[PDB]
Ligand binder design. Structure first.
Ligand SMILES: NC(=O)c1ccc[n+]([C@@H]2O[C@H](COP(=O)([O-])OP(=O)(O)OC[C@H]3O[C@@H](n4cnc5c(N)ncnc54)[C@H](O)[C@@H]3O)[C@@H](O)[C@H]2O)c1
Ligand SMILES: NC(=O)c1ccc[n+]([C@@H]2O[C@H](COP(=O)([O-])OP(=O)(O)OC[C@H]3O[C@@H](n4cnc5c(N)ncnc54)[C@H](O)[C@@H]3O)[C@@H](O)[C@H]2O)c1
Ligand SMILES: N=C(N)NCCCCN
Ligand SMILES: N=C(N)NCCCCN
Ligand SMILES: N=C(N)NCCCCN
Lengths: 474, 474
């Protein structure tokens, strides 16, 4: 049977019942022991309400807002008799404020994004830097500095950000084994960072190819995606963003850094979902990805930073997303950016609408002695349907990661504010792996120089194939 | 019943029986009187042969090459006893060499592209300027100057290039009429150029949106299009090219001019099918087009050039393609450029495989008093099926233009080498319009600066919305 990892003895307050809430609820019911009615779902959507009613869960049809979130959430989180768990899977809500509220009230917390209150992402008076995931993440790091320890709150623990942090650790272990690098497995951040350095890992792509195909053709003036349309558009219109490696010797003219914070990132003055990068996955082989900003682009580069005694970085990997979403989402971005405005309507593909495909999601570690190594999940829609309900393959990678984070938090409930990079990666992957389909490590001799230069002159650097100069599509 | 325009008393030699040849054959049979034994098709393809056999037409299964074209075509084109007609709808053959051969032997000639012999388009030894459509066109103009007059030979008379030159003339007349300007239409090149100047037309997009959708989802590693995949990929890997307007105040760093020739164009040192421009059509409204090189980008700009007494251009419109192909072609380009190689296989969508959609193809005249005006054809797949066999909507705009050019040629026997800009636009549109669906003119207040600047700073020129600086996606 399915493993039951823990008992939960307090309220489980799920904020949001979109594609990820819908996929996560069945895993929570499956893998935890608790009186069923301790679970309650909060979502303003009529669609969400109807689905929640069919699943027989307490449902509160309300938008969580800056004005109401304390009045709304505290009674739910503190109902007792035991410790509650806030499972935040929403858009338009402040991750930071809800996290701090849960912690004030002794409730566990998990989310999959550092989301702001409604009005941030398209605020015209905000500087591009302030709209960056680096900036959003720095608010979480500052919160941790302000109130160290206390109740566990897990930030950005979905598939990516989230699971991919655990993949990076496993990939580093595998590379070390394959390259004959000796020593016991790292047990501290500094040891992980030095292992990456010693292996010669210049950078990392979060290298993803979603091949899920719908049973209907893309409709005109409809944004189609396999997960949040609102969320993908939000991150897609944020600046392109990357963890910035010490080996990089070029940045584009419209790249900018940060005056404060962990120091691990740069951003570009252009939207990430209209920024292309050359990348690679096992099934796609060479492909374009979009350089969409992601928390882990910064958190992984930060985590793997080696500093000298003076606090200066001597090593840091480049790290960023290289996302090839489903074909209908590729068309949706072409339509949105070509129109200069969001489509009138949108839809998220249901498993019943998907005719085949996989969400191939892994980490591509490059620059080392075997050139490039991709490690990750090749989960298909067919396998997804066999092992978890109410979601597609994109959804299941995310929901299972939330499941893993919940198990970790319940096992470690007084660890304070943590990121996916802070968790025990083996324990998390132990929990998650039943839901990931084939999990494989693949070497390739592909580099961003492949086939180049072609018929035209290009701004390339063939002395160093993996330079961002070569990866960025200009 | 359908009109029969003319008798053809000599051989009709069709070179090529791909998507355009298959669509053009029935129109030639429909609209001209000739003994069936006079028409013969030449194509090396087995698939083409089987279709030709099913249609009861003479078929010679042979590739036309530099080595064999004289030995093959001179007898066929002079079989007699009257004047023959070479209808060249092929790839990998020299338009110039074949048109000169037809002329030398008194046969009429028409084609839809200035195509070179096999070995030219992907030659990395040739400099990008020499691979340009500007340069190919100059060879045709030179041939005309060296042997003026003689047998009529029509260059680049498909939908675009071709028909869209007629649309520009009709659009100019319409713009004037809509302003309350009465009187004689232009009758010389110089007068057409002056009309464009006088109306304040700053530039022209060949503004196309193909919404034909397939009955099957796009296959991986298959290039899908609604017309020649080989031809589209070839032009798409040529440099981006555009007729260059006198109003333009900026060009990109990798733009280059031509040291000789008509002077009307520039090219970019990058492939046109991976170059995006902001544009507009009635059904698409604001969209991205690809800046794919096209003969008419140069020929229309050249045609509409006004020079001073010193022979210096004082007015010329910008003119270029702004192509949004069918959704599966958009995905095919994303795939080809992202992988850095041509797909393993390709297919052209048959009308039986198209569930709906239109080929909306027109000219967008901008910069005048009513800002922008789109004039052109909205041909649906539904309309296409009602009125012509063996083709989709893309095919029928092209095949009907070839029909119109043929009627024109038979009515204008000794015209020498002519461009679509040289043809009598009202006569050609009279013949073509039954096959075009609605031919409509639509004003819009949209400009490339709609919604800009937005969330990020941009190098835009707010003093002049239609500047290429604002159009080009950078
Ligand atoms: N880390 C990852 O791997 C990952 C992956 C997918 C999604 N995400 C994030 O997870 C979140 C959920 O994604 P999804 O695919 O379920 O999105 P979705 O768009 O399907 O659902 C979002 C839900 O939030 C609800 N909502 C909107 N405003 C709200 C408010 N004020 N209070 C409460 N609920 C509100 C909506 O009604 C909707 O049901 C998004 O923020 C998304 O960016 C992270
Ligand atoms: N101006 C326009 O609007 C326009 C529009 C569409 C196509 N075109 C041009 O028309 C031509 C045909 O397009 P299509 O859609 O029919 O292309 P297609 O790829 O469907 O067909 C091309 C045909 O040419 C044949 N061919 C190849 N080599 C040959 C040779 N050496 N001799 C004779 N035939 C040969 C092929 O076997 C094939 O059947 C292309 O050059 C294309 O660029 C112009
Ligand atoms: N349904 C619940 N609330 N808990 C179920 C425990 C796990 C049984 N598979
Ligand atoms: N420093 C450079 N320019 N190149 C370094 C390249 C290292 C790849 N062997
Ligand atoms: N089949 C021909 N060759 N010509 C036919 C023209 C008249 C058809 N109604």
């Amino acid at each position: 049977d399915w493993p039951v990892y823990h008992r939960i003895d307090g309220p489980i307050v799920m904020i949001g019942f979109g594609s990820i809430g819908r996929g996560t609820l069945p895993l929570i019911e499956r893998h935890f022991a608790f009186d069923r009615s301790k679970l309650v779902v909060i979502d303003p959507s009529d669609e969400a309400r109807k689905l929640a009613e069919a699943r027989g869960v307490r449902f509160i049809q309300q938008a969580v807002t800056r004005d109401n979130y304390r009045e709304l959430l505290v009674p739910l989180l503190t109902a007792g008799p035991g410790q509650g768990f806030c499972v935040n899977l929403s858009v338009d809500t402040s991750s930071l404020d809800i996290m701090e509220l849960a912690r004030e009230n002794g409730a566990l917390y998990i989310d999959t994004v550092v989301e702001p209150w409604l009005g941030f992402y398209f605020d015209p008076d905000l500087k591009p830097e302030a709209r960056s995931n680096y900036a959003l993440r720095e608010t979480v790091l500052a919160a941790r500095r302000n109130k160290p320890g206390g109740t566990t709150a897990v930030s950005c623990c979905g598939a990516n950000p989230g699971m991919v942090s655990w993949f990076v650790k496993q990939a580093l272990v595998n590379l070390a084994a394959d390259l004959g690098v000796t020593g016991e497995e790292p047990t501290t951040r500094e040891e992980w960072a030095r292992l990456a350095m010693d292996l010669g890992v210049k950078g990392i792509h979060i290298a993803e190819r979603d091949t899920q195909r719908a049973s209907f053709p893309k409709p005109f003036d409809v944004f189609v995606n396999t997960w949040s349309v609102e969320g993908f558009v939000s991150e897609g219109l944020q600046p392109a963003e990357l963890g910035w490696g010490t080996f990089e010797r070029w940045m584009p003219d419209n790249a900018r850094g940060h005056d404060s914070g962990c120091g691990a990132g740069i951003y570009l003055l252009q939207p990430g979902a209209n920024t292309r990068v050359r990348s690679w996955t096992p099934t796609a082989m060479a492909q374009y990805g979009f350089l969409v900003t992601h928390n882990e682009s910064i958190s992984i580069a930060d985590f793997l930073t080696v500093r000298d005694a003076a606090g200066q970085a001597v090593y840091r990997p480049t790290c960023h997303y290289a996302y090839h979403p489903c074909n209908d989402a590729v068309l949706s971005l072409h339509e949105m950016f070509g129109s200069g405005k969001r489509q009138s309507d949108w839809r998220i593909l249901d498993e019943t609408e998907i005719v085949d495909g996989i969400d191939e999601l892994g980490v591509l570690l490059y620059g080392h002695g075997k050139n490039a190594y991709w490690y990750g999940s090749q989960l298909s829609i067919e396998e997804t349907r066999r092992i978890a309900p109410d979601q597609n393959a994109t959804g299941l990678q995310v929901s299972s990661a939330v499941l893993a984070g919940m198990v970790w938090a319940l096992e470690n409930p007084n660890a304070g504010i943590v990121e996916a990079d802070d968790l025990d990666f083996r324990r998390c992957l132990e929990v998650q792996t039943p839901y990931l389909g084939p999990v494989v490590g693949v070497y390739t001799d592909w580099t961003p120089l492949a086939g180049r230069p072609g018929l035209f002159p290009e701004d390339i650097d063939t002395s160093d194939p993996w330079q961002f100069r070569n990866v960025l599509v200009r």
